Amino acid sequence: QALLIKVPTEIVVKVVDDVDVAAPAVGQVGKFDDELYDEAGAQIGTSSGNFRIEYVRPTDGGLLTYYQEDITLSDGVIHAEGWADFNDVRTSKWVFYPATGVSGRYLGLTGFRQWRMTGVRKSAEARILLGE
Amino acid sequence: ETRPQALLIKVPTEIVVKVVDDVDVAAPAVGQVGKFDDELYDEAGAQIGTSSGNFRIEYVRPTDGGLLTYYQEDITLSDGVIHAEGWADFNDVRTSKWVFYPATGVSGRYLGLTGFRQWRMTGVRKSAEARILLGE
Ligand SMILES: C=C1OC(=O)C(C(=O)[C@H](C)C[C@H](C)C(=O)/C=C\CCCCC)=C1OC
Ligand SMILES: C=C1OC(=O)C(C(=O)[C@H](C)C[C@H](C)C(=O)/C=C\CCCCC)=C1OC
């Protein structure tokens, strides 16, 4: 009924970007490819995605970025896309956005992709929380 | 099950029992607000809780003209309280699409759980469908 996939290690195996991490700006973009590891560190899949910093939120100066990604797990695909504050990304805080099970065991399931950067341009901790 | 890792609460009928608002649903604008009181029902038509909440339309997103709206509510289920708050696009609210924002268990069964509150309007100023999805 409800499923939690905890991913303590997510590795960024390639990223192409013109993001200035110390000073991000609207218009900056990234395309990335990740590998995902379970709680005892075997491979559970890959993600491929991109993002774009889109606007400055006037309430807090947030640098609102749109992410879109396909997470190919070993027992089904999951699509995730939505908004994140890049000021949270770069200060190692958690972000999240909707995820939709696209096939396999994940057919029918919807919920949320969560992650926090543990290593600039290199690693993240992630969760995938799903229900039916 | 003891100490589930993940937990889904399905709310197929959420009735808005009381709403006070100055929102023009046909042409919404920044500064408009509502306060709402809801009753939550399971698949069997039993009442599982209530919600007390408010919202404010805060800003216009330059991307798409989205009307970004900040929600906040206290959801009292019969077995504990969940707080939830965050951003939703009022264009989605009014065209009956799903919206969501973070949720945090505050007491009872939900203490120490976090996840998301999600809902879709099924009738403006009348009713919605909803899900609370939590993890530990
Ligand atoms: C899922 C990721 O969301 C990210 O933002 C990110 C990145 O690494 C960017 C592609 C590079 C950019 C310069 C950056 O933000 C760097 C640090 C974040 C590290 C990982 C965060 C998940 C992602 O993975 C590639
Ligand atoms: C879960 C709800 O979150 C809402 O925003 C809402 C409402 O009904 C508003 C309080 C009134 C506003 C004028 C409106 O848009 C009315 C309907 C929205 C969708 C229908 C119910 C979700 C909620 O329930 C009270």
Residue numbers in the entry:
A (entry chain D): 10 to 141
B (entry chain B): 6 to 141
From the paper:
The second comprises enzymes which function as explicit [4 + 2] cyclases, including the Diels–Alderase AbyU. This biocatalyst generates the spirotetronate skeleton of the antibiotic natural product abyssomicin C in the marine actinomycete Micromonospora maris AB-18-032 (previously Verrucosispora maris AB-18-032). Structural studies of AbyU have revealed that this enzyme possesses a distinctive β-barrel fold, wherein the barrel lumen constitutes the active site of the enzyme. Access to this site is regulated via a flexible capping loop, with catalysis promoted by the conformational constriction of the linear substrate 3.18 This mechanism is consistent with that proposed for the related cyclase PyrI4, which is derived in part from unliganded and product-bound crystal structures of the enzyme.
To establish the mode of substrate binding in AbyU the substrate analogue 13, a non-transformable counterpart of 5 was designed for use in co-crystallisation studies. Recombinant AbyU was subsequently subjected to crystallisation screening in the presence of substrate analogue 13. Resulting crystals underwent X-ray diffraction analysis which yielded a structure of the AbyU-13 complex to 1.95 Å resolution. Inspection of the AbyU-13 complex reveals an overall fold comprising a homodimer of two β-barrels consistent with that previously reported for the polypeptide. Four copies of AbyU were observed in the asymmetric unit (AU), comprising one intact dimer (between chains A and C) and two copies (chains B and D) whose dimer partner resides within a neighboring AU. Electron density corresponding to a single molecule of substrate analogue 13 was observed in the active sites of three of the four copies (chains A, B and D), with a single HEPES molecule in the fourth (chain C; Fig. 2 and S1–S3†). The percentage occupancies of 13 differ in each copy of AbyU; 80% in chain A and 70% in chains B and D. The side-chain of 13 exhibits greater conformational heterogeneity than would be possible in substrate analogue 5, and as a consequence deviates from the s-cis configuration implicitly required to enable catalysis to proceed. Superimposition of each of the four copies of AbyU reveals equivalent side chain conformations for all active site residues with the exception of Met126. The side chain of this residue points away from the active site in each of chains A, B and D, but inwards towards the barrel lumen in chain C. In chains A, B and D a single hydrogen bond of 2.8 Å (oxygen–oxygen distance) is observed between the enzyme and substrate analogue 13, formed between the lactone carbonyl of 13 and the side chain of Tyr76. The conformation adopted by substrate analogue 13 in our AbyU-13 crystal structure is consistent with the substrate binding mode indicated to be most favourable and reactive in our simulations.
